[PDB]
């Protein structure tokens, strides 16, 4: 379903080390432990969608993400790399698919639903992060 409306919490979190490594982020950040856990409010009116995750790193802010699908907009990363990329998000089907275009070849994501349970698959060049939540 296309309907990805909810309070996501978490439960499974394969290769994030894998990602985040080929994100190459600074030590200044990195230094910091990163969360095992992860929130992600969505909240979606058709194409029209606002989302608020817990931060990757300790004492950080929820990182806000809002767009429409199909307009181009300007992302810094704040909440993980400190990057500036060109995202883009469009439909495939049911699967939200986001291109962030910039420095990092492959770098996007592909969020879709089943039931009760959001998937969430972060890449960034030949490394992929897969994530699922269970719905609160």
Request: aromatic letters at 12%.
């Given at each position: 379903?296309?309907?990805?409306?909810?309070?996501?919490?978490?439960?499974?979190?394969?290769?994030?080390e894998?990602?985040?490594?080929?994100?190459?982020?600074?030590?200044?950040?990195?230094?910091?432990?990163?969360?095992?856990?992860?929130?992600?409010?969505?909240?979606?009116?058709?194409?029209n969608?606002?989302?608020?995750?817990?931060?990757?790193?300790?004492?950080?802010?929820?990182?806000?993400?809002?767009?429409?699908?199909?307009?181009?907009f300007?992302?810094?990363?704040?909440?993980?790399?400190?990057?500036?990329?060109?995202?883009?998000?469009?439909?495939?089907?049911?699967?939200?698919?986001?291109?962030?275009?910039?420095?990092?070849?492959?770098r996007?994501?592909?969020?879709?639903?089943?039931?009760?349970?959001?998937?969430?698959?972060?890449?960034?060049?030949?490394?992929?992060?897969?994530?699922?939540?269970?719905?609160?």
């Amino acid at each position: 379903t296309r309907d990805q409306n909810g309070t996501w919490e978490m439960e499974s979190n394969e290769n994030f080390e894998g990602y985040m490594k080929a994100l190459d982020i600074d030590f200044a950040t990195r230094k910091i432990a990163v969360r095992l856990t992860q929130t992600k409010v969505i909240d979606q009116d058709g194409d029209n969608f606002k989302t608020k995750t817990t931060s990757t790193f300790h004492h950080h802010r929820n990182y806000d993400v809002d767009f429409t699908v199909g307009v181009e907009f300007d992302e810094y990363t704040k909440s993980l790399d400190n990057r500036h990329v060109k995202a883009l998000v469009t439909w495939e089907g049911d699967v939200l698919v986001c291109v962030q275009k910039g420095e990092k070849e492959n770098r996007g994501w592909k969020q879709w639903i089943e039931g009760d349970k959001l998937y969430l698959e972060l890449t960034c060049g030949d490394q992929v992060c897969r994530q699922v939540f269970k719905k609160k």
